Amino acid sequence: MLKIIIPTTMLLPMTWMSKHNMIWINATVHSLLISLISLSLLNQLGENSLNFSLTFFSDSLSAPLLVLTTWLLPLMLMASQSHLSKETTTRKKLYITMLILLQLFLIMTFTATELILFYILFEATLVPTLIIITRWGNQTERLNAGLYFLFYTLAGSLPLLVALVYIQNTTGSLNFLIIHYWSHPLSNSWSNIFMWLACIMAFMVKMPLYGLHLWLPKAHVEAPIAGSMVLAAVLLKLGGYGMMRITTILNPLTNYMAYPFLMLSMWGMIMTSSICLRQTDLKSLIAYSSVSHMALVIVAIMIQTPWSFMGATALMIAHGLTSSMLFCLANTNYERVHSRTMILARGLQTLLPLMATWWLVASLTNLALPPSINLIGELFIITASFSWSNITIILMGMNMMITALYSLYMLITTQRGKYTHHINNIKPSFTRENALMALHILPLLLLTLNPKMILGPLY
Amino acid sequence: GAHLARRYLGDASKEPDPLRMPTFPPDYGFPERKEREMVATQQEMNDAQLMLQQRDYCAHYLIQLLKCKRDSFPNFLACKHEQHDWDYCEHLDYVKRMKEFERERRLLQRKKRREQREAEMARG
Amino acid sequence: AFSAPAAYLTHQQKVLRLYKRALRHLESWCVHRDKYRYFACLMRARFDEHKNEKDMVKATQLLRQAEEEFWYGQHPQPYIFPESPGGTSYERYECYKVPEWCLDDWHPSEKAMYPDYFAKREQWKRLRRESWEREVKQLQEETPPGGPRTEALPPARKEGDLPPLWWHIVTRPRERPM
Amino acid sequence: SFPKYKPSRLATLPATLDPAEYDISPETRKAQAERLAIRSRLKREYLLQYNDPNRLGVIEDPALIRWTYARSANIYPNFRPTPKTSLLGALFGIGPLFFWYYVFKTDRDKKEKLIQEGKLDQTFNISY
Amino acid sequence: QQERDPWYDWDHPDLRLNWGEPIHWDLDMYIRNRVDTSPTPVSWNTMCKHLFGFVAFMLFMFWVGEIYPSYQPVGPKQYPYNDLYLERGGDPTKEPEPVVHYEI
Amino acid sequence: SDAPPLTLEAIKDRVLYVLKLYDKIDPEKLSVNSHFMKDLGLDSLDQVEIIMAMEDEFGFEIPDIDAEKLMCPQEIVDYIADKKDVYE
Amino acid sequence: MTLCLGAITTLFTALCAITQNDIKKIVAFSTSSQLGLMMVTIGINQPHLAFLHICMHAFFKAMLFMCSGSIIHSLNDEQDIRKMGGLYKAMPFTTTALIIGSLALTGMPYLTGFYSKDLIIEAVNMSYTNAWALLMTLIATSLTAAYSTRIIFFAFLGKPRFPPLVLINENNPLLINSIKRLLIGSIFAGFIISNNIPPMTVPNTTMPLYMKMTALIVT
Amino acid sequence: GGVHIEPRYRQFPQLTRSQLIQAEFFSATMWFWILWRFWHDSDAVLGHFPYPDPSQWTDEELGILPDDED
Amino acid sequence: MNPFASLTLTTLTILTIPIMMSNSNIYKTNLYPNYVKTTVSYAFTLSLVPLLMFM
Amino acid sequence: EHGHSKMELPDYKQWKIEGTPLETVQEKLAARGLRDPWGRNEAWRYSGGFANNVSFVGALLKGFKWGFAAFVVAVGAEYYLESQ
Amino acid sequence: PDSWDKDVYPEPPRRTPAPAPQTSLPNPVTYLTKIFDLLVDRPVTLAREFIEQQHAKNRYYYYHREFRRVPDITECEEKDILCMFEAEMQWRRDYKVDQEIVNIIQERLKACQQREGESYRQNCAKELEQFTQVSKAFQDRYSDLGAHYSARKCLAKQKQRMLAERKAAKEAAAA
Amino acid sequence: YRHSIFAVTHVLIPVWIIHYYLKYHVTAKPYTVVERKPRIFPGDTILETGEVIPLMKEFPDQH
Ligand SMILES: CCCCCCCCCCCCCCCCC[C@@H](O)O[C@H](CO[C@H](O)CCCCCCCCCCCCCCC)COP(=O)(O)OCC[N+](C)(C)C
Ligand SMILES: CCCCCCCC/C=C\CCCCCCCC(=O)O[C@H](COC(=O)CCCCCCC/C=C/CCCCCCCC)COP(=O)(O)OCCN
Ligand SMILES: CCCCCCCCCCCC(=O)SCCNC(=O)CCNC(=O)[C@H](O)C(C)(C)COP(=O)(O)O
């Protein structure tokens, strides 16, 4: 596994000692190389996993998340090229260092044979993200945003730490393989109820579950473009990955305790999808869309059927790519108008036709158009829920209707109509932006050819 | 339809129920009770795979018609005679069904009159 | 569209607008031309029965039951011209109206074609650049204290002048640019 | 004499049938003049900022900024816990959760009972 | 925003808004793409009455037609081999109760 | 479309043609510069009839605020010209 | 449920069509009523007959729409039937094409709509169905005939009503050929497809003379 | 595609003989088809089997016994 | 062998060729509509054969 | 190549109300004491090729004559060919 | 074709009626088939023979893997991890084998329906019985385990089922 | 000439590719292409066996 870890670490001296004008070029090319090398992780077994060593292992659940994390960094560099131009070279290098640190921590998080190492890195991804939000943010509120993103997260994870340690003192090991093999049922007890709550609520707050989600719109709205991309795409998947990993020890208490969260997520998707309909901001709309899709993933993980796990993995990867693309698009508009309001700039399809086709593709994928892997995840989760209880279909279908509605509302308000008369600084779309969106979208429609690579270990 | 008006406006029991037909033994009319003859055996009708609702007593004419249409293909106006025979057999089946319906209707009239006459005799 | 609205509609304006709407809905009701002509002359005669009317309270008492009589027989599906704000082709060619300033972003290879047009465009731009400095002062002088009272603009009063704020009225895209 | 038109929330009264519009008053006449005055002043400001050959940006609109700020950021500081707010919040935020909890629990209790008594006919149910 | 004057020279003709005026709190609900509160040729309550009456009448009459079905003076269609037992469901090893069809 | 490119001459011909077919106006006295209310002595209503006739003749409808300030055939010709963007 | 839904749809939509002024809206409601009729056909357990009706409706409804488009473009983008007058002689090919299409859609015997719609009505009449849906199917047939009559009368018979500058023209091989292909279709395809395919339903051999012709009588 | 035809301004527009012959021919073939089919096969509309009268059947074939036997 | 399958798939497959060529140079010219119509005509003529086989 | 040949308008005298159903409306209006100033303007809708109208049934039977002639000649040909 | 086995995928003998045209007039179908053959099959077959001779020039092999039999979870010590691991891997491989068996039976069933046409309700009863048998067996063996299935849970389910069967049998015998 | 080159490049080449794919790859795998068994009527002769099916039961033929 170190063939992936070491090069990303070597990126730091590379970007620090590079020329004043060649930091972006070098970072882009070498990050793309690391993506290509990490692509070898995709070959998996139907048996347990590929064991790299005592400390790092990979699985067909860790493989797609790792590949997407490694693939993201070049696009984050391409997106943050623009607004950092007037920045001093030292601060640009600090930005690149933050991004590389985030990539490195996520890479060690997703292998993490042991639960305490996983926890340490899962919480280590907090510092680069917080600094990125609170330092390279635009509005006054970024500072406020930072605090929320911190404390909420910590508010969820500090009990988990205790829980994890307590487990090591009764079972004797937190190594994932042993915990899988030496699993024992959790008898219905108050002590076990609180252990289950401590173990789950740490990851619920990061999905985020409806009700505990208030930090997400603020963090996504105030963060810089790269911060928004990494929050929407990968950092949300930490909670779902962690729940998939940790629900192997929580049976059979999960059947009893999933009700408060299944009800919260099933109703929460309707409420957040409805909120998306009445929104005066693009980034807020996309953030609430992410909340809805992650609520659906939460439901899938709590249902605990093989179809649930397959659909949850597919939806996680697909939504990561989709959300990254949508945030990029909104940022391209924001750089030209400097307002970040949906109603303000309209009729852009006549002015920027290719940006219009990129908008169409992104919204179609978010709308879960078949046979895209968004629909694969949604359909598998809906099918598993229907097996669980025949009445979930009304809620799932209502969510489907509303998501189609607000995705097309976001498309029509910005792209269609008559242009704003008084805005005359809308320059043609650069090659960098179109390359960004193309590199976002091509992996999606290519993975729809080979779904097995993203359907998880239960495929 | 007239029978609809008669049943929904006249006495409900006086006219038969199409769901419960027949309500009388087939031997009630006369003891002969000759039996219907099917020409197409199971194997040549299944090998024909006509349809599950086309497997009625008029199936043999249907088999001849399908043989016709398969053989003389390029002209689709070649054979109307086999179609005519099949249509005639279908009409005869439908007339047998009408006869059965009117038979149950008149037998119910008979039973009603018989019961009424016997009850009147018991009244006197 | 062209003319700036006034502060209110006097009684005559309401009379004429009601008359025109009634005539249009009458034509929609009576499809055939002869029948519409008959009923239009009938309606005009019924409208001028009180033309010479003198007092105003009884006049405004009329054109109030007239409004109700219209709202009762208004033909919920009236005929609308294709390019009208209700027509089947209202904003149809709006997606082809591209602002002129977009031309300033054309690549020099694109601007190599059509050289004469860009010469004339540069002339127009210089004309506007000077005329704007004239127009700002014409408006600050001509405007009564306390801001304008009506959205009406004055014309050009000197020789070399041009009307104030003329650039975005003369440079409409087209009626059917594409 | 004609049947009358009754306005509703989604079927607003027309201008031509608004009783107030027909009955003009001296105070009203003065008011109309001032409304057009402020409207024309704003239009003049927008046209002066609009026709400028130097300007190569967006004409910042204070009304749009105020609308967005009031819709998004201005809600909480003006919030006050009032019987109306408390009752509406309790209903719309708790009632749905418990109603769906009841529905799903009822369905799953029935289904588990049917499974235990064995009268469900779950044949061919291989995927789940 | 549908009932605003369509012949005015608005700054945003599609939106029908003038630069500067106060914006309705719920503008994103009336944008000519959504709920329009225009006056209508028939009063709203009359609309609701007529539509609901038509719907309820149709549902009641469909139920009535269900309770009074139409048909023809015909007995049931007759099928040759024990009401076509072998090729509908099958089970060839039970010897179903023989049904014999009357020739009339 | 495939519509002919109508010009100002066609416009003025059609205006004067439509106004001649108005029996209330003698064809000898009405000229391209003949005012409506004073030179022709027409009522305001008959001005509205003229406006609607020109509407139905040209296929597009004139806003009444712009229509009621149309008092001369040359004014109407120029209004229709500016609306439909004719060069010559 | 399928039978009831098809019946209510066809009745309500034909009733709405009967009084429209946009030609495109009239033909849209026509096709919606036809879809309702097809759903009725499915409800009476005759799916193959509904497929044949799909096949015939394709031809004649598509060519009706093409004729309406020719009229619309000819009269300078106009759709209200209140502004097309005498087009019987002004454009003869569009007139005859839409006349043949209206006769076919209305189930004129020995056209493309006859072999499908006639069998639909015969099948529903002699089946154990709801009385109300039967009544609505017959009424919808009559209303289909009526709004076809409306299109013809209001678009072709009276005196002209369009603006004085006439731009009516048909002299284009593309429009003519595209119309005439579908015209040949809507004339002969019904016979060809009906007689070529093997039979898939038991025919309705015996039938009262009055219920036999009820389609012709009601149309 | 076609020929050059001019607008005519308040009179009947110019029509070529070609489209008139085409319209007349297609109307003619439509009607000829209808009467050809009606002559050759009139059974599709009018029917070709008779409908039996149920009251005409005598009780001998309906298995009806005169009120007394069974 | 069995031309039915080959024809029934090739009609659909040639229905997509103009979409493949949409990025070519023919797209930027005025021969694209003629191209698409000709392709549809060919596809219909080709799809006629399996109908004859079934009949 | 477009329709640019300087098309000519008619003469405004050529429009007469004579022979049109505008006599009926004019007579009914004068019978009450009114006149239609625009009656001449619609004259072109009843003057030229628009003068003759066709009934609805006259519309349905566009080609009944040629169809009937062809049908009878076909029946004659088949009668003479079959009876051989 | 020997590319697969004719006994795992049984097929009826495919009896086809010889054409017996009753009409003198020629059909277009035979001409269309002849032109299709000479215009498509011949070039395709020539290209395939070229490709096949090129393949036969360079011939080489690949093999199918064999897996030995190891103790299963029923012969696993409570806390031993190596033998438990081996038993888990073997149970996973048996799980996949079972899924592919059910897939084989399903393919057989679908083919049976499609071939039989309009008589599928009768002729395909044997395939239905095969699929019902395998479906029932598969369901008892692998259903209701959950996302985190394992050998231990399958054994526990089997033990519970055998306890219930033993109780029912003992009650039935002694009543 | 244009239509000849069109039919060559747009009909002949794709049908060659599809015919190859079907007759050598798709049919290589079992049950990929399943055909409804052709209808069997009495008196027909089978190419595989040469057996002639018995005719029908000689129904009464009147009218
Ligand atoms: C016709 C072609 C079809 C297939 C195309 C294949 C493309 C090949 C490149 C893409 C693969 C990505 C690399 C994924 C694997 C690399 C990581 C690791 O798994 O491989 C390493 C080894 O991989 C290679 O050594 C390095 C792969 C590097 C791929 C780069 C190819 C493209 C570079 C182009 C650079 C541009 C030139 C300069 C421009 C300015 C370590 O394995 P190793 O332990 O050793 O071998 C053990 C095997 N034993 C034990 C049996 C003996
Ligand atoms: C964004 C905010 C989210 C907040 C996340 C935190 C909420 C999680 C729920 C409580 C977390 C703390 C629980 C303790 C950690 C697990 C330790 C454990 O499992 O051991 C228990 C210990 O049990 C406890 O210590 C529980 C004490 C709980 C104290 C804090 C309670 C906080 C309120 C919980 C009730 C509300 C539940 C939902 C939380 C909503 C938060 C928004 C067993 O005790 P033994 O000594 O081993 O007994 C064996 C001998 N008989
Ligand atoms: C079919 C749908 C129903 C429609 C019904 C329509 C309503 C019909 C009833 C109409 C009743 C009335 O007219 S309500 C009568 C309202 N009161 C008056 O008309 C008197 C004062 N009018 C004026 O002075 C004008 O200036 C005038 C002289 C007219 C012209 O002005 P000009 O000199 O500058 O041209």
From TrEMBL, chain A:
It catalyses: a ubiquinone + NADH + 5 H(+)(in) = a ubiquinol + NAD(+) + 4 H(+)(out). It is an enzyme of class 7 (translocase). The chain crosses the membrane at residues 21-41, 61-80, 92-110, 116-133, 145-167, 193-216, 223-244, 256-277, 284-303, 309-330, 351-369, 389-412, 433-449. One of its GO terms (cellular component) is mitochondrial membrane. Its EC number is 7.1.1.2. Keywords: Electron transport, Membrane, Mitochondrion, NAD, Respiratory chain, Translocase, Transmembrane, Transmembrane helix, Transport, Ubiquinone. Residues 1-109 form the NADH:ubiquinone oxidoreductase chain 4 N-terminal domain. InterPro entries: NADH4_N (IPR000260), NADH_Q_OxRdtase_chainM/4 (IPR010227), NADH_UbQ_OxRdtase (IPR003918), ND/Mrp_TM (IPR001750). Residues 112-401 form the NADH:quinone oxidoreductase/Mrp antiporter transmembrane domain. Its main location: mitochondrion. One of its GO terms (biological process) is ATP synthesis coupled electron transport. It is found in: Mitochondrion membrane. It is a multi-pass membrane protein. GO terms for molecular function: NADH dehydrogenase (ubiquinone) activity. It comes from the Eukaryota. Belongs to the complex I subunit 4 family. Core subunit of respiratory chain NADH dehydrogenase (Complex I) which is composed of 45 different subunits. Core subunit of the mitochondrial membrane respiratory chain NADH dehydrogenase (Complex I) which catalyzes electron transfer from NADH through the respiratory chain, using ubiquinone as an electron acceptor. Essential for the catalytic activity and assembly of complex I. This is NADH-ubiquinone oxidoreductase chain 4. It comes from Sus scrofa (Pig).
UniProtKB/TrEMBL annotation, chain B:
GO terms for cellular component: mitochondrial inner membrane; mitochondrial intermembrane space; respiratory chain complex I. The keyword Amino-acid biosynthesis does not apply. It is a peripheral membrane protein. Keywords: Disulfide bond, Electron transport, Membrane, Mitochondrion, Mitochondrion inner membrane, Respiratory chain, Transport, Ubiquinone. InterPro entries: NDUB7. Belongs to the complex I NDUFB7 subunit family. This is NADH dehydrogenase [ubiquinone] 1 beta subcomplex subunit 7. It comes from Sus scrofa.
TrEMBL record, chain E:
Its main location: mitochondrion. Accessory subunit of the mitochondrial membrane respiratory chain NADH dehydrogenase (Complex I), that is believed not to be involved in catalysis. Complex I functions in the transfer of electrons from NADH to the respiratory chain. The immediate electron acceptor for the enzyme is believed to be ubiquinone. The chain crosses the membrane at residues 51-71. The lineage of its organism: Eukaryota, Metazoa, Chordata, Craniata, Vertebrata. It comes from Sus scrofa. Keywords: Electron transport, Membrane, Mitochondrion, Mitochondrion inner membrane, Respiratory chain, Transit peptide, Transmembrane, Transmembrane helix, Transport, Ubiquinone. Belongs to the complex I NDUFB8 subunit family. Complex I is composed of 45 different subunits. One of its GO terms (cellular component) is mitochondrial inner membrane. This is NADH dehydrogenase [ubiquinone] 1 beta subcomplex subunit 8, mitochondrial.
UniProtKB/TrEMBL annotation, chain H:
It comes from the Eukaryota. Transmembrane segments: none annotated. One of its GO terms (cellular component) is mitochondrial inner membrane. Keywords: Electron transport, Membrane, Mitochondrion, Mitochondrion inner membrane, Respiratory chain, Transit peptide, Transport. It is a peripheral membrane protein. It is found in: Mitochondrion inner membrane. Accessory subunit of the mitochondrial membrane respiratory chain NADH dehydrogenase (Complex I), that is believed not to be involved in catalysis. Complex I functions in the transfer of electrons from NADH to the respiratory chain. The immediate electron acceptor for the enzyme is believed to be ubiquinone. Complex I is composed of 45 different subunits. Belongs to the complex I NDUFB2 subunit family. This is NADH dehydrogenase [ubiquinone] 1 beta subcomplex subunit 2, mitochondrial. It comes from Sus scrofa. The chain holds residues 36 to 105 of 105 of the full protein.
